[PDB]
Design a protein around this nucleic acid. Structure first.
Lengths: 205, 262, 151, 50
RNA sequence: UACUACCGAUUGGAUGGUUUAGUGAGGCCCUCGGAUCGGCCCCGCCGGGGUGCCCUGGCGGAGCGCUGAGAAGACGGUCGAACUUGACUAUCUAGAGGAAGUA
RNA sequence: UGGUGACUCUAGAUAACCUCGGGCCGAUCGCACGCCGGCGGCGACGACCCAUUCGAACGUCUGCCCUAUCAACUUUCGAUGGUAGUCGCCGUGCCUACCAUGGUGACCACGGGUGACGGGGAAUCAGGGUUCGAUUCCGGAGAGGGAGCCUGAGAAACGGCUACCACAUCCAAGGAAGGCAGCAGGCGCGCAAAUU
RNA sequence: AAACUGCGAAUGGCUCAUUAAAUCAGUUAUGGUUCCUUUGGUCGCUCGUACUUGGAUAACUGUGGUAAUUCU
């Protein structure tokens, strides 16, 4: 019986309307299904026209895109850190649109070394397992080492991202609506937006 | 209402069907189809009210259910099927072919055409879009979509369909100097030559048409159907040539038809 | 500062602004490319629109609205809300029995883009119909002409 | 009680009326779809589980 | 000689409408719940085929095996008729007394 | 590539994702029979998507009777607006969070009344007017009063369901069933209206 | 015949209680939506037992309960 009608509101002058018709079905609202972080649990809503909606009630994974590199990978979701609308959607860890979220970085790390042949997020102890040595220090052809070193002239990240790759957790912002399509998708925060949300998280805590 | 309506009262039926008051409470209520229900002839009205082949709706059911009526080359057993502007109604058993063309008073005439003419029709292109791997599309005024038209065909042009294949043979462009029929409004059923088109952005354009006797009239752009190129129509025209007589000269013609006949 | 006053990061949604680049452009000239469009009814986009730095999602020139419907005009009376003003439209209504007229008026809350700075009261705005932007706001300021005395 | 008793091996049924509460002690406080050895029903009912 | 209408105590009783406070039928959503019903396994009695082993074929048995489906019910949330007690207000009715005018 | 007065349109290119309460990519039916074991002619029922038709729903502008013995109202419990969301078929205070203090009014707001459903129309009429319109066409609303839902393309459906309130039926007293402001008909009400 | 399946039962009919910028009328808009059906398009565009797959359940047969239902 949640409704979205205009006729229960005051007029612009401030006088109250009398209702002339009672609640219709096309003016209905549904409960505000709050997504959490957990193993995947998605319910299905039958909507107007016979179409279909997806209430994600629990998500743990969704794909986020590195905007500068154009690298989109499916990635585990760690934690919610900042919600720009309410602060109580953070202590409850609710996933909605435009919320700031901590994601994994290892699908972006494995793409970065496979494409640019540089270490990223490695410690100064430099303990390297023999798995990634044969992709970081492979034997390769002259024409192919030419291409791999021609890529290395621009393979430079901001310092604000590499300290996140040090901890294995990038910062991302959800761009889709998880109550309406059952997915948590988005993009990795970079640049002015990144330092904006960094000082917001800094001032909030 | 709680949903779509299925009846039509007889007084609220379109005026050009020329139904009368006392034979019933209801009108035939056209089915959904290629033409709008304010702009169509249902097949039951054409077959007993115009052609007088039937005397009831039951006899129209009996005539149509013998698969004797082809509208645009396909058999229609629906008795309220909306036939419309420039559809070819072809009855094979009697050897007749008809095309629905407005009279000078804005009603569909019983226009008989030769079976040479009954293999084509003209359509007005209403929408062009490119869809799903760059295939261009048409949408005509009777809900046909055509893949891969000629790239010179633009919106408001008039193309020619072959009724068996469904493909374009040729087309007319929208330009001043071509011939029209008005398919809407006060000027409905009149025929003349385009002389002008004034473009008002954000609203409807106005097209000025000149009659064969020098009369001139405007319509909107959506009420314009390009018949022919220059002065030659690509179809046969009805009894009046799209020249609306005034009531005085119509009275004079009707009186001159009595002092000579008899 | 000077844009980011809200709790969420304001940006034009159509312009990507984290395109990586080499230091000869990363240090040389720093300019966010601005999105703007041309509304279609002969109205020309102001200079402050295409070069400004404000972020308004309801602006007719740099935001996501379309202008379609009725072109009207009123006179500014109240400038007291955030990015939206109140205009007054005066007209004469014909009473038929007396063959005469009476002065009526109607108010309109209308959205004012930040590209029209130096808008006083008493001057004539041209408004264009858009989609409903608020509970009572349906129009959008398209052109400002000054009052009679402001030289 | 009456006892609508069936036998799905040959599909023949029978209604036996038992007006003796000593026999019905076996079925009390049970549930549906729980098997009970029907020894208390008589003497022909020895190896019978219903 | 009678009517008319008021105040009217009764805070008569009953009913309605606004609100304070308290309660909350029912559906829907959510977190559980798991009465029951299957399948795949594991053995037993064992045919055929291929080769003591495997696939089929019939069962039967048990295993908190491991999964699928799943009703009652309950915590919570929401929508929310109604219920109780107030306050204000209105009406219908039982009601002593009287007054004036009405004739 | 194409279009519009105007796109953040259509089409294209790249990187991925693609919901167990799963998206499409045919395990369906008839008739006539066949041509060189294959290749088949008409239909019927389907089907994601696109377009069309019938709509629907939200908006734009102007327009309504009496009342000031109704002059200030709205804002606690959204009032007016901004930002981000949630929900919705979508636009939007529709709802939430945080901010701003706005919005309407003697050009009559707000409140009340109406023996007020609104129009097309009707009677009267020198010209101007005045009164009526429940009523067969169009639009709205409601099925005793409120409320909540299921199914479905479409309903907050009542010749569907679930409650409460008021009435009311059958009963073996445990329970069960209801909704004529459809057609008839009855009672009542009345000055006032027809055939089970 | 029955029964399962599909569709329709949201139209029509009735009434005028509510309702005073509300309804409604003329005008516009959806570039801000959904749409059974009809009509046209699309339906080897996908590079990865089929000469046909599996479990049920009505109608029917048979045994019943309740004072009582279009109960089961």
């Amino acid at each position: 019986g949640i409704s979205r009608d205009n006729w229960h509101k005051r007029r612009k002058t401030g006088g109250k309307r009398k209702p002339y018709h009672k609640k219709r079905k096309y003016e209905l609202g549904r409960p505000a299904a709050n997504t959490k972080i957990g193993p995947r649990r998605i319910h299905t809503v039958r909507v107007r026209g016979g179409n279909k909606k997806y209430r994600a009630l629990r998500l743990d994974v969704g794909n986020f895109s590195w905007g500068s590199e154009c690298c989109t990978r499916k990635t585990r979701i760690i934690d919610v850190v900042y919600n720009a609308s309410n602060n109580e959607l953070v202590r409850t860890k609710t996933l909605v649109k435009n919320c700031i979220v901590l994601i994994d970085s290892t699908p972006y790390r494995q793409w970065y070394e496979s494409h640019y042949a540089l270490p990223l997020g490695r410690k100064k102890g430099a303990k390297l397992t023999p798995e990634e040595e044969e992709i970081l220090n492979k034997k390769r052809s002259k024409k192919i080492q030419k291409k791999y070193d021609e890529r290395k002239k621009n393979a430079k990240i901001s310092s604000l991202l590499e300290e996140q790759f040090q901890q294995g957790k990038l910062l991302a912002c959800i761009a889709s609506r998880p109550g309406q399509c059952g997915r948590a998708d988005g993009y990795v925060l970079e640049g002015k937006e990144l330092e904006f949300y960094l000082r917001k998280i800094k001032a909030r805590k | 209402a709680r949903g779509p309506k299925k009846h039509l009262k007889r007084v609220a039926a379109p005026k050009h069907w020329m139904l009368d008051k006392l034979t019933g409470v209801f009108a035939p209520r056209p089915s959904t189809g290629p033409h709008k229900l304010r702009e169509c002839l249902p097949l039951i009205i054409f077959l007993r009210n115009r052609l007088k082949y039937a005397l009831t709706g039951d006899e129209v059911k009996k005539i149509c259910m013998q698969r004797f009526i082809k509208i645009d080359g396909k058999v229609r057993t629906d008795i309220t099927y909306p036939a419309g502007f420039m559809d070819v109604i072809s009855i094979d058993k009697t050897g007749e072919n008809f095309r629905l063309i407005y009279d000078t008073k804005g009603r569909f005439a019983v226009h008989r055409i030769t079976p040479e003419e009954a293999k084509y029709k003209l359509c007005k292109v209403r929408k062009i879009f490119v869809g799903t791997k760059g295939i261009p599309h048409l949408v005509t005024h009777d809900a046909r979509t055509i893949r891969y038209p000629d790239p010179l065909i633009k919106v408001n042009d008039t193309i020619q369909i072959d009724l068996e294949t469904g493909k374009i043979t040729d087309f007319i462009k929208f330009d001043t100097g071509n011939l029209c029929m008005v398919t809407g409004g006060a000027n409905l059923g009149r025929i003349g030559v385009i002389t002008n088109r004034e473009r008002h952005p954000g609203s409807f354009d106005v097209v000025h048409v000149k009659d064969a006797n020098g009369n001139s009239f405007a319509t909107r752009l959506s009420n314009i159907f390009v018949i022919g190129k220059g002065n030659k129509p690509w179809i046969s025209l009805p009894r009046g040539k799209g020249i609306r007589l005034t009531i005085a000269e119509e009275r004079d013609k009707r009186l001159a038809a009595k002092q000579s006949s008899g | 500062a000077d844009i980011q006053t809200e709790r969420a990061y304001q940006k034009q949604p159509t312009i990507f602004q984290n395109k990586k680049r080499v230091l000869l452009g990363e240090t040389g000239k720093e300019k966010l490319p601005r999105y703007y469009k041309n509304i279609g009814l002969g109205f020309k986009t102001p200079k402050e629109a295409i070069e400004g730095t404000y972020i308004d999602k309801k602006c007719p020139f740099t935001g996501n609205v379309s202008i379609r419907g009725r072109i009207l005009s009123g006179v500014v009376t109240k400038m007291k809300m955030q990015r939206t003003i109140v205009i007054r439209r005066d007209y004469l209504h014909y009473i038929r029995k007396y063959n005469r007229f009476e002065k009526r008026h109607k108010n309109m809350s209308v959205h004012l883009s930040p590209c029209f700075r130096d808008v006083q009261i008493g001057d004539i705005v041209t408004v264009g119909e858009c989609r409903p932007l608020s509970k009572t706001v349906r129009f959008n300021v398209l052109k400002v002409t000054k009052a009679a005395g402001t030289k | 009680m009456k006892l609508n008793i069936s036998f799905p091996a040959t599909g023949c049924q029978k209604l036996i009326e038992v007006d003796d509460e000593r026999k019905l002690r076996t079925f009390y406080e049970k549930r549906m779809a729980t098997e009970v050895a029907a020894d208390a029903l008589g003497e022909e009912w020895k190896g019978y589980v219903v």
